[PDB]
């Protein structure tokens, strides 16, 4: 009996399933569902939700669930694009880590211990409250949890300078399938490597990350300028942007959010500079005069204030609120990574289809900088030198447009088909934090599939990790040979050991 086991093991914060919309269960369940595509009355629901309040409670929670027949699901921020943190094709128990959100900062070693329920915003806020000369590289989305984010890499506006979030992890507490509490020394370098980008929900439950805090100026510079132009000018802006974005010095980042709310397009250029406005403006006057950036556009502020700004927030304090939803639309998204420059016709066609769909968006980021200097096998994220751009295709819709779902999905699929010849090939690359099930999936309940799991999973595995896929399988076998931690695209162990 799970409730008996949990009670005896001192795990008191738990709620069983209830169909009552007003129950604590239903509220907790939906509190961290960040993609409404997976909220509806259909879709798998957990038999119980458990909120461990300590690493020991997390350890025993894992032990208890497993004594039953249940599949374990871990949820930090709940931002899984495919809702893999709170859904399962088999009966499951949901471990919600929201009560594990403590940040301990050591200003002397300039490191920090971060409980895996902590959101990026909670982390950013905690850093500012301790220092104005320190920051950390990760996503702009403040409600994204460190649990899944760092586990899958973690790309952000400072990654051209400092690489991924996972690239700056120096230790971690990992709790395995037996509840064993392990640090870097205990888990070994192969497992410690795998958790730094190998994908969440595969290796065990990360209790906490030990991260290196990174030097930032007292004042940095950001700007957000939107250009409402025609497809023809937009195409030329984007065709030049790709070179600027990648070629910029590592102290710079220029990102693009694109949409066509009509059949003209809008382009929002987002810029960041580790320094003051004069060096920032001088650089873009030179490299990108077409943006029409003036002195008034360059805003100086603290690092924390900049990330609050880039997140579309008003104050630094709003970073420390994990339940703040500025958007609440269902969505599906895909991503490409490029090796060769995109011809002008690539952007043209992309914007063309964008105009045909007002609920469609794109997000564009250049790599280069330090992303080119980090070895491809430093951590599981393989897309380093030779990788030019990350291109995200998104379609999102509210509760009014629900019936147009299959329409929206057909659009995205065709956008993706169109971009096929211009982006990476053999294999077509992906990013594990941009988990995409269109690429396929494993049924761990089908014994035929499971026995050939490695070669079946090699499809998406090499797309996410390339040649790092092989080492990940070994690390999986070291830490979870019986595959207690699994989902449709989780790394398979060396064989079926059950
Ligand atoms: C919603 C959202 C996602 C974003 C955004 N912007 C991003 C960006 O600028 N850069 C990025 O690199 N990624 C961005 N993403 C995507 C997120 O990076 C991913 O969606 C993260 O994986 C989200 O992490 P989290 O919020 O924790 O997602 P969950 O659904 O809770 O978990 C995902 C996955 O990880 C496993 N897992 C969670 N917690 C743990 C622990 N402690 N240990 C092991 N495994 C864990 C889950 O089981 C699940 O499988 C911008 C926005 C708005
Ligand atoms: C289980 O954990 C939740 C989350 O921390 C607890 O809920 C919080 O309770 C405090 C005060 O009791 C409120 O200020 C918070 O707003 C609550 N959070 C949420 C998300 O509702 C809950 O009390 C815990 N339950 C038990 C039995 O320990
Ligand atoms: C199990 O998987 C194999 C291969 O994917 C398939 O041929 C078989 O029909 C599946 N079994 C069931 C019951 O679906």
């Amino acid at each position: 009996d799970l409730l008996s086991c949990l009670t005896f093991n001192g795990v008191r914060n738990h709620t069983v399933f209830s169909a009552d919309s007003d129950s604590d269960f239903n509220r907790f369940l939906h509190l961290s569902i960040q993609n409404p595509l997976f909220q509806n009355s259909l879709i798998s629901k957990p038999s119980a939700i458990i909120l461990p309040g300590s690493k020991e409670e997390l350890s025993n929670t894992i032990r208890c669930i497993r004594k039953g027949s249940w599949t374990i699901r871990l949820r930090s921020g709940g931002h899984s694009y495919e809702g893999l943190s709170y859904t399962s094709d088999t009966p499951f128990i949901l471990i919600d880590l929201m009560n594990l959100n403590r940040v301990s900062i050591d200003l002397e070693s300039e490191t920090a211990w971060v409980e895996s329920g902590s959101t990026l915003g909670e982390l950013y806020y905690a850093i500012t409250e301790s220092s104005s000369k320190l920051g950390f590289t990760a996503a702009w989305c403040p409600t994204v949890g460190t649990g899944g984010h760092i586990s899958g890499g973690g790309f952000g506006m400072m990654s051209r300078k400092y690489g991924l979030a996972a690239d700056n992890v120096v230790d971690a507490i990992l709790i395995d399938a037996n509840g064993a509490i392990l640090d870097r020394q205990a888990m070994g370098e192969d497992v410690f490597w795998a958790i730094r980008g190998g994908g969440g929900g595969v290796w065990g439950a990360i209790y906490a990350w030990k991260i290196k805090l990174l030097p930032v100026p007292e004042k940095v510079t950001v700007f957000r300028v939107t250009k409402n132009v025609a497809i023809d000018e937009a195409t030329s802006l984007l065709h030049k942007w790709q070179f600027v974005a990648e070629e910029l010095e590592e102290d710079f980042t220029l990102s693009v959010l694109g949409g066509a709310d009509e059949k003209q397009v809008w382009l929002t250029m987002l810029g960041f500079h580790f320094g003051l406005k004069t060096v920032a403006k001088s650089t873009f006057d030179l490299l990108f005069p077409e943006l029409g950036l003036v002195e008034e556009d360059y805003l100086e502020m603290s690092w924390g204030e900049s990330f609050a700004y880039l997140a579309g927030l008003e104050t630094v304090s709003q970073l420390n609120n994990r339940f703040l939803k500025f958007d609440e639309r269902a969505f599906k998204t895909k991503v490409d990574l490029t090796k060769e420059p995109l011809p002008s016709k690539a952007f043209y066609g992309l914007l063309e289809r964008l105009s045909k769909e007002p609920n469609g968006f794109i997000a564009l980021n250049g790599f280069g900088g330090q992303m080119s200097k980090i070895s491809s096998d430093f951590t599981p994220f393989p897309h380093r030198s030779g990788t030019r751009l990350m291109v995200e295709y998104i379609v999102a819709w509210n509760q009014s447009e629900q019936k147009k779902k299959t329409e929206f999905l057909d659009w995205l699929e065709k956008v993706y088909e169109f971009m096929k010849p211009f982006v990476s090939k053999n294999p077509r690359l992906g990013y594990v934090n941009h988990i995409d099930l269109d690429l396929g999936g494993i049924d761990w309940g089908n014994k035929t599939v499971v026995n050939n799991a490695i070669e079946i999973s090699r499809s998406w595995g090499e797309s996410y990790f390339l040649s790092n896929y092989e080492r990940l399988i070994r690390a999986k076998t070291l830490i979870d040979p019986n595959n207690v931690f699994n989902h449709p695209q989780s790394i398979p162990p060396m064989a079926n050991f059950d």
Side-chain angles (χ1 to χ4, degrees):
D1 180 52
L2 185 60
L3 288 199
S4 284
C5 178
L6 291 177
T7 300
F8 272 119
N9 275 263
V11 183
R12 300 320 298 256
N13 198 320
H14 52 89
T15 76
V16 301
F17 178 93
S18 163
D20 187 2
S21 290
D22 300 341
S23 57
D24 275 7
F25 172 83
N26 181 82
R27 185 168 54 89
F28 284 148
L29 171 60
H30 282 104
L31 211 41
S32 295
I33 299 184
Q34 306 290 1
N35 191 351
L37 183 59
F38 300 100
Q39 70 186 357
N40 316 83
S41 84
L42 213 76
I43 300 155
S44 50
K45 300 225 175 306
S47 310
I49 301 174
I50 306 168
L51 282 70
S54 73
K55 66 183 188 296
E56 293 82 15
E57 282 190 13
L58 176 53
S59 171
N60 290 332
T61 293
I62 289 171
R63 292 185 42 257
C64 288
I65 299 173
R66 176 179 187 181
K67 287 186 183 149
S69 56
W70 294 284
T71 298
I72 292 172
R73 279 291 173 269
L74 302 164
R75 182 171 72 183
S76 179
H79 265 267
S80 173
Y81 286 167
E82 298 277 25
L84 299 184
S85 54
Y86 49 88
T87 67
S88 176
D89 41 282
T90 51
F92 66 108
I93 302 293
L94 179 53
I95 306 179
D96 199 290
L97 305 165
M98 58 168 291
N99 285 347
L100 299 175
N101 61 346
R102 296 169 192 74
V103 178
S104 318
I105 294 167
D106 177 11
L107 286 178
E108 295 299 304
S109 49
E110 286 176 345
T111 57
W113 275 102
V114 183
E115 289 185 338
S116 63
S118 309
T119 62
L120 301 180
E122 283 175 342
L123 174 56
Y124 298 153
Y125 174 80
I127 293 167
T128 63
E129 295 281 314
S130 258
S131 167
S132 53
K133 303 169 180 50
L134 294 171
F136 187 73
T137 171
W140 60 264
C141 303
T143 61
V144 162
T146 57
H149 190 62
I150 299 188
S151 289
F155 184 86
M157 300 283 296
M158 303 202 318
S159 291
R160 303 187 68 259
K161 172 80 168 174
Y162 291 120
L164 309 179
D167 294 331
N168 296 273
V169 169
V170 298
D171 204 326
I173 301 307
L174 178 67
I175 301 180
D176 71 7
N178 299 327
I181 302 175
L182 310 161
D183 59 5
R184 180 177 184 175
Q185 186 179 35
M187 74 177 79
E189 285 302 294
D190 286 322
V191 176
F192 178 71
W193 171 83
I195 62 178
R196 284 178 294 150
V202 177
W203 320 99
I206 299 285
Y207 158 67
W209 305 101
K210 192 181 181 187
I211 59 173
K212 181 69 187 187
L213 297 181
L214 314 164
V216 295
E218 299 268 7
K219 240 56 186 166
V220 299
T221 310
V222 298
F223 59 81
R224 172 161 63 221
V225 165
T226 311
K227 276 211 142 52
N228 300 274
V229 303
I231 302 178
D232 308 273
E233 183 182 356
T235 303
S236 92
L237 282 170
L238 289 186
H239 184 266
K240 185 184 179 171
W241 164 85
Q242 77 184 307
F243 299 108
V244 178
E246 184 195 352
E247 288 158 21
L248 275 165
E249 290 298 288
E250 60 181 40
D251 284 351
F252 289 90
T253 301
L254 180 61
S255 302
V256 186
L257 301 179
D261 292 347
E262 304 282 22
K263 286 187 180 162
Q264 61 112 15
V265 309
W266 57 272
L267 302 178
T268 303
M269 312 290 303
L270 305 144
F272 180 94
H273 173 55
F274 294 80
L276 298 159
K277 61 200 307 179
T278 63
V279 175
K281 177 167 185 299
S282 163
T283 300
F284 283 102
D285 282 347
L286 221 29
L287 292 182
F288 221 155
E290 291 95 334
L291 293 192
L293 282 166
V294 294
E295 229 200 287
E296 294 76 349
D297 292 329
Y298 299 88
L299 307 166
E300 294 178 0
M301 54 189 77
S302 66
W303 166 78
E305 281 166 3
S306 59
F307 272 25
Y309 179 81
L310 294 167
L313 305 179
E314 296 177 354
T315 63
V316 168
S317 289
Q318 297 180 291
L319 295 171
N320 204 41
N321 180 26
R322 65 188 301 119
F323 302 121
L324 192 55
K325 308 221 209 307
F326 183 52
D327 190 333
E328 291 95 333
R329 300 184 289 172
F331 68 90
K332 164 71 190 187
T333 172
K334 306 186 74 78
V335 73
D336 272 312
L337 294 105
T338 67
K339 306 297 263 189
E340 304 295 345
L342 298 178
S344 197
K345 53 173 199 251
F347 283 113
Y348 182 89
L350 190 54
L351 304 170
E352 216 179 17
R353 287 137 166 100
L354 209 43
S355 47
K356 288 186 303 175
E357 180 45 77
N359 289 262
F361 300 82
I362 53 176
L364 310 157
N365 277 284
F367 280 17
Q370 201 66 31
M371 289 293 289
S372 285
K373 290 173 179 158
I374 297 166
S375 178
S376 67
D377 72 330
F378 174 67
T379 59
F381 186 87
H383 310 125
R384 310 294 187 165
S385 176
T387 312
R388 299 183 180 264
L389 312 174
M390 184 163 69
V391 179
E392 308 170 52
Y393 324 97
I394 309 136
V395 63
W397 67 94
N398 59 32
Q399 301 165 326
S400 322
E401 330 171 23
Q402 178 181 0
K403 290 294 170 63
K404 283 189 254 158
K405 164 181 156 176
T406 71
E407 200 174 285
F408 296 138
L409 272 57
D410 186 53
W411 176 80
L412 190 64
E413 186 184 349
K414 288 194 277 142
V415 167
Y416 195 73
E417 174 65 23
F418 165 60
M419 293 298 299
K420 184 155 70 190
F422 309 115
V423 304
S424 57
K425 326 162 185 92
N426 305 322
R428 188 173 186 171
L429 306 178
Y431 172 30
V432 73
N433 268 332
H434 271 244
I435 198 85
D436 193 353
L437 290 186
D438 293 351
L439 285 45
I442 295 276
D443 186 343
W444 293 107
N446 183 323
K447 196 183 191 69
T448 308
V449 182
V450 180
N451 284 288
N452 199 35
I454 294 185
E455 293 303 321
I456 295 178
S457 296
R458 189 182 290 280
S459 161
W460 47 85
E462 301 198 331
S463 186
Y464 295 148
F465 312 109
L466 289 175
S467 66
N468 290 330
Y469 179 65
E470 306 287 353
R471 188 180 175 188
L472 287 169
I473 295 174
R474 177 156 61 94
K476 171 69 179 184
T477 306
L478 277 169
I479 201 63
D480 189 27
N482 298 122
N483 203 24
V484 171
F485 299 89
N486 60 85
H487 65 72
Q489 288 182 352
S490 64
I491 299 292
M494 280 184 184
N496 188 342
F497 289 103
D498 70 322

